[PDB]
Amino acid sequence: QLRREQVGGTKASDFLEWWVIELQDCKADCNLLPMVIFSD
Amino acid sequence: QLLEGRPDQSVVIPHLFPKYIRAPNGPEANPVKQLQPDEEEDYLGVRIQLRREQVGGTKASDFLEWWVIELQDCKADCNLLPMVIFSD
Amino acid sequence: LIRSVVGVVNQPIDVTVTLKLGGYEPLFTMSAQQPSIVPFTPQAYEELSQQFDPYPLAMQFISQYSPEDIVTAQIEGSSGALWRISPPSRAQMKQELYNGTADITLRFTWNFQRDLAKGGTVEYTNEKHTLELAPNSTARRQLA
Amino acid sequence: LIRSVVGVVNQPIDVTVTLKLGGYEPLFTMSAQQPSIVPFTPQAYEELSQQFDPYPLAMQFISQYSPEDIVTAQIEGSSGALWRISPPSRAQMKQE
C-alpha cells in the first residue's frame, strides 16, 4: 500500500510515498503481522 | 506538544543518560557502577528539539522534522555531547 | 558430565524484516523490538499443538522446541517510515515496469538478533527470499 | 610465559548512539567517527583522577583503565539528519 501525503511527477514527488504491507486474508489485525519464529 | 507544532519548547527527559560507560571484550558494554552509584540520579539529561523546515497536519508535514538533543545543563557546547567510554 | 548440557534457550532480543524491490532501494523495513516479541506461554504451546494435532511430524517438531523455544514477532505492518525514492530511480522504475519487458525480483529478507548474553554464536542470523516476477502480467501492472 | 599477556588496549574505531521512541521508528541517531573520538592524554587521565579523588573506588577503577583505555566521544547533538515520519505513524503518535 502506497499512502500519499500532500505537502505545500512533481505532484507525485509532492506526495510522500511509503510501502505498507497488510495480510492478504486480514480481518481485524490489519495493522500487524504475527510471524512465528523458533528460538533454538 | 513538540511533535504537534508550535514555537520552540523543550521536553521532560529526567537524566537517563549515564556519563561514564565501560566497554569490555564481553558480549555487551555496561555502564560504570562505581562512577554512577546513584544510577539514574548520576546520569545526565538532554532535551528533544524539533526544528521545522518550510518547503514550497499538511502544514506540519510541510515542515521537515528532526529530533535534536542538547544537554539539560549546557552552557557553551550546546551542539555537542561528550560521553565517556572505557575501552578495555 | 563434561558431555551433559542444559538446553538453555536462546531467544532473539530483536528481529528485523525488510522488503526490497530490484537493486535500487528497500521499499519497506520493520523491526519489532520488545513488546511486539511475544514468547509463547505454555498455553500458546498447547494451542500450536492441537492446531497441528493430526500431523505427526508437526507434533514431534513442536515437542522438541519448548514454548520458551518458540516466539512470535508482531511486526507492525503499517507503522512505517517514509519511503524516500530518488526520482531518477522512480522514473526508471516506472518506465521499465511499463515497457521494459525484463524480469525484476524482490529481495525480501529476515534477520534475527539474539540476546548475546544467551550466547547464540552468530547473533544476526538471516535468510533472503528472492522470487522473480512475471513481465506482461497483472502483478507488474498493479505494482506500476 | 604462555600465560604472560600484554595489556594491549582495544579502542573502538567507531561509536553509534540512537534515540528511539515506541516501536515505530528511531527519532534520532548519531555516530562520532574519528575526530569526535578523543582518546585521553595522560593529563586528561590525571584530570579524571583529581575530579573523583576523594572517592577510593573511583581511584582504583581509574588506576586500572589507563588513559589509553578510556576515551570520550564528542557526539554531535544537533548535527542530525532529517527525521522522516510516515504520517499514519505521526497521527497515531499524536492521538495516543
Structural notes for this entry:
This is part of a larger assembly, with four copies of chain A. With 40 residues, chain A is α+β, with helices and mostly antiparallel strands. Chain A is built from one helix and one strand. The longest helix of chain A is centred in the N-terminal third of the chain and has 5 residues, at 10-14. Chain A is elongated, with a radius of gyration of 16 Å. The N and C termini of chain A lie far apart (34 Å). Strand 4 of chain B pairs antiparallel with strand 4 of chain D, so a sheet runs across the interface.
Count every beta strand of chain A, where a strand is a DSSP E run of 2 or more residues.
1
Judged by helices, strands and strand pairing, the structural class of chain A is alpha+beta
Distance between the termini of chain A: 34 Å
What string gives the helices and strands of chain A in order?
HE
Over all CA atoms, what is the radius of gyration of chain A?
16 Å
What is the makeup of the main sheet of chain A?
none
Query: Which two protein chains have the largest interface (Cβ within 8 Å of the partner's Cβ), and how many residues from each?
Result: B-D, 33 and 38 residues
Strand percentage of chain A, roughly?
Answer: 15-25%
State the helix count of chain A. Answer: 1
Question: What oligomeric arrangement do these chains adopt?
Answer: part of a larger assembly
Portion of residues within helices of chain A: 10-25%
Shape of chain A: elongated
